[PDB]
Every structure is written in structure tokens, then in C-alpha cells.
């Protein structure tokens, strides 16, 4: 499989849409 | 008196629990929100469409990441015909030790789920070979989905927020989406096949590092500009081409053999490369048709309002009044949404019809359960997209429709003769049902009385012809590409049937699903399908056309789309609304796709097991459906767990029972209606204010029973979820337990 290191890169990169999804879903109103 | 829901002051002033439930089913309905104007509507839908778009890329990235990290893709490359794929892994604390040993399968360390969605066959076809390309494409889709999550936020800021006239510029979408979204993307995928996927098909690694150095063709783009395009169709991959190796390889990148690869039994990758290249040229040319700010091209509003055919005065195009339809499509959003679901609903089933007969993925015709699931999946998706086409088409006639703007045109003339449409739809539904059910029951009684020769068996001689007019020798009709003396067989002026020697090899073999052999058992079921299509359409069209009122109840437009009834008066009006004709049809739509997928599944269980005689004898009478398909195949399933032990089918044995329970729960919301239950809750409200310790606490929202329209939603939700999960547990485990 993939290495143990590469899983943590995928988790940190996944915070970038996780932050932007929180910005879009709150710009669309409450 | 709360401030939830924000989008409605009439719901937020509701003391009951109706406040909670109607927030959910009116939340994404942007058109009924408080103070929603017209330009604020489009600007909110457009940024919402970036939200659903970025769910899709985040969804497709978890398919890549859970396979790269928990699946056996690199072990599946070595032998795709026996190595059984892996979707993800199970971490369930509630497992017992015989249920970890039963799901430790496919050569894995822990419990894994066998993937039955066929995504290993699609990724292996398009060039991906190791677990690092799967991870690289996963991380790319994290960034590519965040590029749309930022785009939807950006296009809600005040000077980046688009105006109203930008949305209603319909001739400029059709030029950009046809040429760019359809045409360039088909051109780009043809670039992906030729540069990458076809060289990966020949044992020759082409990645991101060496694609600028290596050329797909040793000729190398010199025969493109000089017009010597026949160099691209030189020596192809031969009939001894072992896939992803150099044995029997070729140099051609655009070829036109037609038919199937001899090993993988899929379409040739060189055929797909000239396909999506030719589709790309036909769409970029199609995207230079409509008028934009460059003062050239066709104008749709002038094409509708035209009244003169070369001097002759007419009523419009085809001498039919199509005036005002441009201001009807473009001004309404439910006319657009009701339209494009019909367009997407046609192609979704059309995807499924052409992927079992024409497989395009390496080694997918021999992995059976992945192929039985992909047909039934995109058939049920095509069901909802067609029911919602008539549903959102009928919201148009209630809410958005204006008879003065649409006066005298073709959409007005349908509403005049609407009693003639529903009558002749009611005829064909009864004309088929009285005589299709009649011939099954005739064959049931005749076989039961021990004299089965008295069956009424009809050969499908009008679809026997088409398969012989496409080149099947097996019936001996001897016409039209099965007649080797035909004008259509030879292409008399030019003789350019390049596809035809490779097509007739594929259609005349009994080792594929290409134009299956049909008999009298297939006559009755296609007329049973035609019973289901004309009857589901009957409910949906009649609910669309009578949506603006009728004799029993005029002015139904004043009550909106979903209202319960108009009381017990005039004999009663239970299920009268246009929403209620959406509602009755989804029982039929789930039914009809049952018939098209019971019949799909049982014809292929004879092909996959070598017993074609079981279907052709027993599918003429309804016991053979009931016995030899429903009863006989559910023996591997139901023994998924018994008092002797478990095996790997015990989830599907548990989900099969789970589906029978969600299905049966939904009857409670449909047989029993509301007023029984409001008189029951009023006794629980009593016995909570009287219990001495438990009346310290008390509700904030007064408990009321579910409303009339609500538990027809909730009743149809338990019905539909249980209908899906029952068959999807039977489809998988009866196929994945037999192979």
C-alpha cells in the first residue's frame, strides 16, 4: 500500500477544502 | 416565536413540532424563502451549484484514497480474472471473532469489503498501474474540490457577484458549454488515451515525467499537418495482444476495427481514441452556431418567433407555433430543471443499455457481480431523473406558467386537448395489462394442468429482424449486413465498411452480451415493460396537465404544489394535488425498474452458468419467475448466518432482512393516516403532565402528529429505501455467491 507518511499529507491537504467548505456554507446564510 | 427557520416567518411562529419538520423540506427550496428576489435567487443557486460540484470531487477522491491505502490494486494487476477487489476495510468493534475470520478475505490482513462497483477495471483501463498514481490522483482532487469551494465563496462577494442578465444569456452558454465543456473535454480525453492510456496498454510506461519526451507515434505529428492521416491507422494491436504487455502490440493510435479486444473482451482503446476525437470535432463545430457579442450566428429567439418559410407565411417552425417558448424556457427555472432531468434521465438509462452489451473496460465482462451492479445502479438513477422531470415540469405549470405569454403556441395547444392525451394513455395501459397479464395467467394454468404445449408463445419477430438486420446469422433472416449481397453490407459506391469485419465477429459469437439471443420469454417481458412505461407516464402527465385545476377542483394553482386535500366535501378529495401524482408514480417507477432488472438479472444467470434452457422454458409463466429465480437464488443469501456459523455473505443476509423491515415500516404511514395518531398523542400529553417525577421536564415544542403531506413523504421514504436495499442485497449475494 502507500506509506504511513503519505496518509498524513492527505489529511493536512484535506483541511484546505474543509476550511473552504465552512466558508461557503456560512456565506450561504444561516 | 423563535428565529428558526430563518427563511420563513410563518414557520418560525409555529408552537408545535411542525416547525422542525417543515424547515428540512423547505430549506433548499430557494424560491419560497422570505424576501427572495429574482436576481438574488440565481446568484444563490449558482454558488450552491459549486457546493454540489465539490461534493462530487470529494466523493471521487475517497474512492481513490481508500483503494490506494486499504485495497489490493497492485495485487489485482497481476491477475484481474481471479483476484477479488477490495473497496475499504472494516473497523467494527461489535464484531465477534468468527466475523473477523469471515471477512478477512481477498488476501488481506484485516476485514475488507469486496468492491462491486468496478472501479478497478476503469482505472486499470485508463493507464493507472500502481498505488502511487491512485494516491496522486486522490490528493489532486482534494485541491480540485477546494478550487470550487473557493469559487462559490468568491462569486457571492458584492462586486464579484454576477448580474441578472449574465444568467439569462442563454446563447452564450450553449456556445461555451458545447464547444468547451463537451468538445474540449472530449478532445482532452482523446489526448489522454493517445499519450498515456494506449501506451500503458502496451507495457510502455508513460507518466508525468516522460510524456514530454516520448511521442505516442514514431511518425510523431508530421502526418497530422500534412494530411497523411492514414499513417495513424497503421499496424494495430493484433489478435494476440496480451493486455498491458508488448506481445502483439502495435504503433497505431487512431484505429477503426470495431468489435472487441480478443482477450479483455472490451472495446479497443484505439477505437475509443478516434471516437472521442471525432466527438470533439462535432461539438466544437456545434459550439460556433449561436449568436454572441460578435454579431454572427443563429439567434434562438428569432428562430422561435419566425413566421416565414422562404416567402411562404407559416405559423412557425414546422408550421407549428413555437413563439414565446424562448421566454418560457429561459425565464423559468422549473421549466429548465424539469426539462434537463428528462434529458439526463434518457441518457442515464442509455448508459446502462450500452455498458453490458458493449463493455469498454478491461476484464469487466468476466467479473460478473461488478457488471450486474452497474446495470441496476444506473437504471434506478434513471428512474428518479425521469420522475423528477415530470415533477419539476408540473411545478412549472402551477407556479411559473403564464398563459398570456404562452398564448396560441404549441405548449398552449397541449393544454387544450389534454383529455385526449390522458384517454389514449389510459387505453394503452389497459390494452397492455388486460392482455399481458392474461397471457401469463393463461400459461400458468396450462402448465399447472400438466399440458404445457397449450401455452401461447409468440416469437418476437420484429426484434428478431433487427438483430438479423445488424448481422446475426443465428436466425437466418438474411438481410441487411447479414445478407452479404446487400447494398448496406457492401456500401456500394465507396466500400468503406472498415468497422464491419470486426463487428460481425463480435455479434456472431455466443460468448458476450452483444445482442443476446431472444425468444418467446422475451416477448412477454418487453410488453410488460411497455405496460410500466405507459402507466407511469399516465400518472405523471395527468398530474402535470391537471395541475392548474379541473372539474372536481378548479383553481388548484391557488393552493400551490403540495397540499393535502380540499376536505371531505364533493365526495372527498384525498390525494388530489399535483404533488400527489408525483407520489403515486414512484410506486410504478420502482415497480417497472424491478421488471427490467429482474429480467436483466435472470437472463444473464443463464448465460453466466451455461444454462440458457432454464430461462427460455420457464420465463413464459409466472411460477418460473417465482420459483427458478426468487426462490432458487436466495439459498446462498439466507444462509449467510445460521446456527452453524457465518461467512462473508452475512452482511447481505442481514441487509436483506433490514430491507424487508424498512419496506414494511413504510406501510404504517400510508394505510393509517393522521387523525388516528393525533388522538393518540393527546393521551401521552395527558399522562406526562400527571406523572409526578417526570413532569419536572416539559417540551418546548408541543407534540403533534405528522401532517398529511409529510407522512406521504416519510411513507414513501421508508418504502423506497427498503425497496432498494432488499434487491441490492439479493442482486449482489446471489451473483457473488455463485460467480
Amino acid at each position: 500500500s502507500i506509506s504511513d507518511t503519505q496518509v498524513y499529507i492527505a489529511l493536512v491537504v484535506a483541511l484546505i477544502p474543509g476550511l473552504l467548505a465552512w466558508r461557503l456554507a456560512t456565506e450561504l446564510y444561516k | 416565536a423563535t428565529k428558526f427557520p430563518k427563511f420563513s416567518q410563518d414557520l418560525a411562529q409555529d408552537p408545535t413540532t411542525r416547525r422542525i419538520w417543515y424547515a428540512m423540506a423547505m430549506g433548499n427550496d430557494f424560491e419560497s424563502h422570505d424576501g427572495m428576489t429574482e436576481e438574488n435567487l440565481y446568484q444563490k443557486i449558482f454558488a450552491t451549484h459549486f457546493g454540489h460540484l465539490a461534493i462530487i470531487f470529494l466523493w471521487a477522491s475517497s474512492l481513490l484514497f481508500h483503494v490506494a491505502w486499504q485495497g489490493n490494486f497492485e495485487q489485482w494487476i497481476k491477475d484481474p480474472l481471479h483476484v477479488r477487489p477490495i473497496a475499504h476495510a472494516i473497523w467494527d468493534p461489535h464484531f465477534g471473532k468468527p466475523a473477523i475470520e469471515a471477512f478477512t478475505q481477498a488476501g488481506a490482513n484485516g476485514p475488507v469489503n469486496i468492491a462491486y462497483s468496478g472501479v478497478y477495471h476503469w482505472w486499470y483501463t485508463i493507464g493507472m498501474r500502481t498505488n502511487t498514481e491512485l494516491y496522486t490522483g486522490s490528493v489532486f482532487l482534494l485541491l480540485f474540490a477546494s478550487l470550487f469551494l473557493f469559487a462559490g465563496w468568491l462569486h457571492l462577494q458584492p462586486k464579484f457577484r454576477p448580474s441578472l442578465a449574465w444568467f439569462k444569456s442563454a446563447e452564450s452558454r450553449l456556445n461555451h458549454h458545447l464547444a468547451g465543456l463537451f468538445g474540449v473535454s472530449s478532445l482532452a480525453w482523446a489526448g489522454h488515451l493517445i499519450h498515456v492510456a494506449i501506451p500503458e496498454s502496451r507495457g510502455q510506461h508513460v507518466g508525468w515525467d516522460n510524456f514530454l519526451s516520448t511521442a505516442p507515434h514514431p511518425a510523431g505529428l508530421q502526418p497530422f499537418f500534412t494530411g497523411n492521416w492514414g499513417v495513424y491507422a497503421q499496424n494495430p494491436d493484433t489478435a494476440g495482444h496480451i493486455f498491458s504487455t508488448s506481445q502483439g502490440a502495435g504503433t497505431a493510435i487512431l484505429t477503426f476495427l470495431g468489435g472487441f479486444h480478443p482477450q479483455t473482451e472490451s472495446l479497443w482503446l484505439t477505437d475509443m481514441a478516434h471516437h472521442h476525437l471525432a466527438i470533439a470535432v462535432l461539438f466544437i463545430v456545434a459550439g460556433h452556431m449561436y449568436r454572441t457579442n460578435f454579431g454572427i450566428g443563429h439567434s434562438i429567439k428569432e428562430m422561435m418567433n419566425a413566421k416565414t418559410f422562404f416567402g411562404k407565411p407559416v405559423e412557425g417552425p414546422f408550421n407549428m407555433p413555437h413563439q414565446g417558448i424562448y421566454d418560457t424556457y429561459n425565464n423559468s427555472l422549473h421549466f429548465q430543471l424539469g426539462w434537463h432531468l428528462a434529458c439526463l434521465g434518457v441518457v442515464t438509462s442509455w448508459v446502462a443499455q450500452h455498458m453490458y452489451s458493449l463493455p469498454s473496460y478491461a476484464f469487466i465482462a468476466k467479473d460478473y457481480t461488478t457488471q450486474a451492479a452497474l446495470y441496476t445502479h444506473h437504471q434506478y438513477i434513471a428512474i428518479f431523473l425521469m420522475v423528477g422531470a415530470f415533477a419539476h415540469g408540473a411545478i412549472f405549470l402551477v407556479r411559473d406558467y403564464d398563459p398570456e405569454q404562452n398564448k396560441g403556441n404549441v405548449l398552449e395547444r397541449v393544454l387544450q386537448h389534454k383529455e385526449a392525451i390522458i384517454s389514449h394513455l389510459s387505453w394503452v395501459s389497459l390494452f397492455l395489462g388486460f392482455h399481458t397479464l392474461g397471457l401469463y395467467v393463461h400459461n400458468d394454468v396450462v402448465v399447472a394442468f400438466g399440458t404445457p404445449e397449450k401455452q401461447i408463445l409468440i416469437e418476437p419477430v420484429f426484434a428478431q429482424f433487427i438483430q438479423a438486420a445488424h448481422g446475426k446469422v443465428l436466425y437466418g433472416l438474411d438481410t441487411l449486413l447479414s445478407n452479404p449481397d446487400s447494398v448496406a453490407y457492401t456500401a456500394y459506391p465507396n466500400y468503406a465498411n472498415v468497422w464491419l469485419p470486426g463487428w460481425l465477429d463480435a455479434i456472431n459469437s455466443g460468448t458476450n452480451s452483444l445482442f443476446l439471443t431472444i425468444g418467446p420469454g422475451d416477448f412477454l417481458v418487453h410488453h410488460a415493460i411497455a405496460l410500466g412505461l405507459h402507466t407511469t407516464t399516465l400518472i405523471l402527465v395527468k398530474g402535470a396537465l391537471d395541475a392548474r385545476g379541473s372539474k372536481l377542483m378548479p383553481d388548484k394553482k391557488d393552493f400551490g404544489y403540495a397540499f393535502p386535500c380540499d376536505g371531505p366535501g364533493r365526495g372527498g378529495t384525498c390525494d388530489i394535488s399535483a404533488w400527489d401524482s408525483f407520489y403515486l408514480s414512484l410506486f410504478w417507477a420502482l415497480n417497472t425498474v424491478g421488471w427490467v432488472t429482474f429480467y436483466w438479472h435472470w437472463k444473464h444467470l443463464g448465460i453466466w452458468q451455461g444454462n440458457v434452457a432454464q430461462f427460455n422454458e420457464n420465463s413464459t409463466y409466472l411460477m418460473g419467475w417465482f420459483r427458478d429465480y426468487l426462490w432458487a437464488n436466495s439459498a446462498q443469501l439466507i444462509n449467510g448466518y445460521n446456527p452453524y456459523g457465518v461467512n462473508n455473505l452475512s452482511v447481505w443476509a442481514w441487509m436483506f432482512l433490514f430491507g424487508h423491515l424498512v419496506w414494511a415500516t413504510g406501510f404504517m404511514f400510508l394505510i393509517s393516516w393522521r387523525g388516528y395518531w393525533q388522538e393518540l398523542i393527546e393521551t401521552l400529553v395527558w399522562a406526562h403532565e400527571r406523572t409526578p417525577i417526570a413532569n419536572l421536564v416539559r417540551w418546548k415544542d408541543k407534540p403533534v402528529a405528522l401532517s398529511i403531506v409529510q407522512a406521504r413523504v416519510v411513507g414513501l421514504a421508508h418504502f423506497t429505501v427498503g425497496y432498494v436495499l432488499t434487491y441490492a442485497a439479493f442482486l449482489i449475494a446471489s451473483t457473488a455467491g455463485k460467480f
Binding site: - | 414557520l11 411562529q13 409555529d14 376536505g567 366535501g569 393527546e682 403532565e689 408541543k702 403533534v704
Partner: protein
Amino acid sequence: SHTVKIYDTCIGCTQCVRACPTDVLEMVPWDGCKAAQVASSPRTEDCVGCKRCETACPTDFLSIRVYLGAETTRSMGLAY
């Protein structure tokens, strides 16, 4: 609450006033019809959406109509 619209086609039959159980309806004098009175609904915050008033009206089509609106405590019929 709900919305009770009374059109100008009724005849003063007084069948709708004698059927609404929360007594929303009442007759006012009106020189139009033969019985010289029209139904009126001055207390529509009490209407429970029963549609007994639409069942009892003779005229085709109905002169009285109940439009089901936002549902408060008086229109849900809750004793609690």
C-alpha cells in the same frame, strides 16, 4: 391562521354560518342577492381549517373558500 375568502356568488343560504364550529362566519346585510345578505368572516383567527363551511355551501362553484395558511395554536386544535 387560515384565510376565508367569500365571493359574491352566494345567495345568503346561512348554511355555512350554521356549520363552522368555531363560529368564524356571520351574516351581514348586502343588497345584492335575493335573501339580501352575504356571509362574512370577521374572526378568521379562530378558523381551524375544518372545511365544513365549504361542504355546506350550495353554489357551484363554491362562494366560500378556506385557504390553509400558517398554523398557530388556535388553528391546530390543541387543548394543551
